Structure formats: C-alpha cells, structure tokens
Amino acid sequence: SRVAKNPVKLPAGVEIKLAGQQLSIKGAKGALELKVHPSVEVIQDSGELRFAARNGDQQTRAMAGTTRALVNNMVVGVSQGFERKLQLVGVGYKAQAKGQVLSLSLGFSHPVDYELPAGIVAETPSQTDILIKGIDKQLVGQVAAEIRDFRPPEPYKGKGVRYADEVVRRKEA
Amino acid sequence: MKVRASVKKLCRNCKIIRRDGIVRVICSAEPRHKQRQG
Amino acid sequence: MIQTQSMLDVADNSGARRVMCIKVLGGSHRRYAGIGDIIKVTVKEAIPRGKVKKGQVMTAVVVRTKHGVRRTDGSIIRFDGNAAVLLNNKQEPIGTRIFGPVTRELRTEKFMKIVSLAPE
Amino acid sequence: KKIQAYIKLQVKAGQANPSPPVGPALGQHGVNIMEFCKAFNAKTQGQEPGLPTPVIITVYSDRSFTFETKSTPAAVLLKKAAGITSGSARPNSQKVGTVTRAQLEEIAKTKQADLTAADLDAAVRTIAGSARSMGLNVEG
RNA sequence: GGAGGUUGGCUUAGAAGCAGCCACCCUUUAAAGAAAGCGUAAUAGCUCACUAGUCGAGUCGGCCUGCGCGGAAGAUGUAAC
RNA sequence: GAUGUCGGCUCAUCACAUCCUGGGGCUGAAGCCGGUCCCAAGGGUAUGGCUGUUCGCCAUUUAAAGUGGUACGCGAGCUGG
Predict the structure, then answer these.
(1) What is the fold of C1-120?
(2) Which of A19, C34, C49, C84 is within CB 3.0–4.6 Å of C60 for a Cys-Cys bond?
(3) Looking at the structure, do residues D45 and D97 belong to the same domain, yes or no?
(4) Could you say which nucleotides of strand E lie within 7 A of any protein CB atom?
C-alpha cells in the first residue's frame, strides 16, 4: 500500500494557510512552518488532507509520497517537540549547556564550544546527557549529528559521544 | 570499501543500493561486506 | 669539520690524534658544519694505545674552527686549527679531559657535560 | 529479560557449585551460579542425583528458577541402559555397542508421562529418539 | 513463542542451536529445523521457520526482448560529433 | 647524390599507473608502528667507493632518495672513456 492514500487528520486546532503553491501550518507550541510543492494536487477537507497527483510518471508517484510525509511532520512539530537523546561514554568526559552555548570536555587539548543555530534548545539533566528540543526533524537531526561527529565512538572501549541507545557495535582488543 | 567489477550480496543483511549512479552494497551487519563499484 | 674529507684533530684524552669528516648530519644536504654540530668521523691516526682503535666509524661534535663563530654583535671569536670531541652511541663524551679552550656558545640542553671539563 | 528456551546447563541435581561441567556458561545471563542451587534443591531424588543433570532452566531475577518436571532424565540414564559413559567419536554412525527398544521398556516406566510427554507410549518413543544423540541408534 | 526429552555425543570452561566429526530423530505443544543466521568464534540474547493478534488490497521470482558502458588509466593543448 | 650510434656534463618539459607531504573505507587496527585499497600532480625527490658503464653491490644519510614519455630529450651546447 502507498502512504499517499492515507490522509493527514490534523489534530486539535492547527491552522492551515494554503495558497495552492505554499502551504503554511500555524499552530500552538511553536508556529511558522511552510513548504512549497512542485506539482501535486492538494485538497482541503473538514479536518483531513489528501494529496492527489498529476501525470502518472515515476516522478509524480514519488513526489506525492514525499510531500505527504513532509506535511505530516509539520503537524506533529507544533504538536510535539522533537527530541534526541545523546549519551556520553567515557572517563573525563562531560557536557554543560550555558544558555545557548554547549561546551564539551572530550579529552582534547582545547575545549569545543558548540553554538546552537536557531530556536532550538539543548538541555543537560546530567553531565553525560543531551536533550535537543525543536520543532522540525531535519533541523533537530542535523544539530544532533554535528555534535556527534566531534568524537565518534570506538569498537575497543566505546569512548565517545553516542546517541539514542541502539547505535553501537564492539570487538575485543 | 572494496572496489570490484562484480558486486553481490554476501549475507542476508546486505541490500544493494544504486546511489548516484553507482552500484553500492551496504551491510547493516559487519562492515567487511561494504563494496563500492561494479 | 666544515665539509666532507676535512681532516681535523680531536680535543680529548682517550681518543685518537686525528680524524676525518665523512658525513655532515642534519638535513637533506647540509654542506657545512659550524661550531656546535654533529658530524660523523672515521679514525685516521691513533695513539699507540688510548681507547679508540684506528679505522672505526664514530660520532663527534665540532668545538673549534678557524672560520669562527659569530655572536649577535659584530664581535667574532676565531681560532686557528679545527677540533672535535668524540661521542658515544648516546651523545655523551668518551674521554675525561678536554684540551685547550672551548666557546661558551656550545652550552645547551645536552652539552653541559663537556663545558664542565672544558676550562674555557 | 532472557526469554528464549533451550538455555543449556549441566550441574548436579541439588548442586549448582560444580562449574567445570559448564564453567562461565551463565555469565551474560546475569545471575551468579550459587543462588541457582536453591532451585536445584527443589527438584531432587528423581533427576539422577549424584551425577550432573542437564535441566531446562528458566531465568528469573527473583532468586528463584522454575525447572521443567523431566522426572527421569535421559541424557545420561540412556548411557547407563546402553552400557557406555563416553559416546562414539561421531554419534549414530560410529558405534560402541548400541541400545535397542527391548531395553528401553524398563527405564520408561517412571516417565510421569504428562510432564515430559502427553501419554505413556510416546514417552517411550521420546527416549527412542533421546538415544539418538551419542552413538545409539533406533534399531528395535 | 519460538520446542518434549535434552547438554545432542566424543571433545573442549564452553563444542549446547552456532570446536572437528556429526545426530537431522521421535515428541509437550496454536509452533518449533535438538537450527537458518547473528550474537560473548563460543554462555545469553536477538531473530529467522514456522503458529495467535494487528493490518485490509494486491504481491513474489524467473523466461524471453528494445534502448541504456559500471567494468574504462599516458605522456606539447580541449583533442576518437 | 649521408637522418652522426652508447654513458657523463649543462638545461629542461609532460604523464600518473604516487616515493614524500595532504584528505580518508577496512584490518587478524590496544598505544607506537603498520598492511591494503579509493581521492590528490601543488612543491620536493642524497653525497661517495668500485666499473666505459646505464644497471648493480656496498658505506653513510634523509620527510623521501618515484616509474615512464620527450630521435631509449639534449654533439650547427660540451666531452670522447
């Protein structure tokens, strides 16, 4: 079955500002998300959305699935805050957020001072945990990746930053 | 990677992807199944 | 001394009387060696008995030359005759007593030994 | 925690202390070996005591391990009815003197036939195939 | 869930479903190959097989066949429309 | 009815199938070292003993002492072993 047939069913008072060319979702708990579609057909029902497609190519059969999952992510974003759990493994490692600055201790010679780009906040409930709250998956996921690539993990000790638990392999020395 | 002329699967976990015009093999298991060109 | 195949004597007691330069250590092709540099000698003429036998590859430091050393001034010290001091496998000297003067320009990290036995 | 059957363990019936029959065979399981013996003491006097007894163990973290009532065992007692201690170098095709169905009748009179079986006849047929491990065919 | 015996034997802490050689059975049982593969090579575990929900229309491999170079690196200057 | 042949000196220019430095999958990669394969031509790339020698074998270095094309580059530029 195809994901382009299932509707959106946007919950709890989410406002659509659709022009036909540039859909604009505005809700509570963060707002101002918008996308532009190249050529699909968007109908606007009583609480759901269906994405009809034009010319039956391989490239309109592929867009209507992509633009359905992108609109669905904007609905959940104003509904729920996207988060990523990053744990720290290793001795002498720590992290502490200072407002909008995330400064780390990774066993280097000089400490790294990572700056968050936009309206996206990193909270640290521990010295070995990061929680990155945002509104869109691609911008939460990009910032979580760039922190991870400071010190990627190791098959011999595991000594390096490591997000949501199931990522790791190992071997003996 | 391991540049060949004939790529193929080795275990049950290998999926063959054609990424940017080249036939790659990525393995969700053991990294020694990673094969580049073919 | 300052070139390959430069005969120069030693300033040492245990050694041989004359040695000859065969290789200037350092860079890719260092052509000259001033005062305070490591060369590699062959032993050309030995005392009837000392410690070092004739015809043996050793390692030495250069301590006196007739071209001179030049400090941060116009003022230069210029001897007459060339002179080396043999070293061990590790760079520490072989003999006990050093003959004649040295310069103060040689004293460094690794050469506080020979400037003790120097008198300058 | 550890939910899959055929978890393999051979220590004695009432006695979990001898490790060189298994060694570190229960390390990544999580539970140390000493507190198992309170569960081996709960199933004694029928499961070939004195000799090391292989038993279906079910791993729990509540300091208790329930075992399947396998009343008379067959991994070692079928060696006793055949006449060997150590089986052949390749079982069921290399032979040292095998067991037949004429000698399986006496040992299977104590099966407690719904605890490792359902009826009495197929528990004899269970120990028919339970000899098929170690150099003992089914010859009749 | 993922087998009844049952640690599948000689062996080796361990060879047990995953040393080497193998048994490849019969059976508790909606189900179970005393194992297909990972997993501490190996102990678990994850699964796979196969059965209960969940899901509510297609799905799966192969055979021929038209057009497409991945394989494809050289010496003065693009430089085998 | 003539296109002067080997090695040396002087001066060079291009290829990349990379010797060094630069970026990097995998490892039977603990660390220091490595092995192997993709990307990269910007600048570098030893003095001697012995032989007519290129080649080689040695002694001592160095970050490294690269493999080819250019009438086996170069005599109206030199030498003539």
Answers:
(1) Ribosomal Protein L14 (2.40.150)
(2) C84
(3) no
(4) 1-11, 13-17, 20-29, 34-35, 37-41, 43-47, 57, 70-72
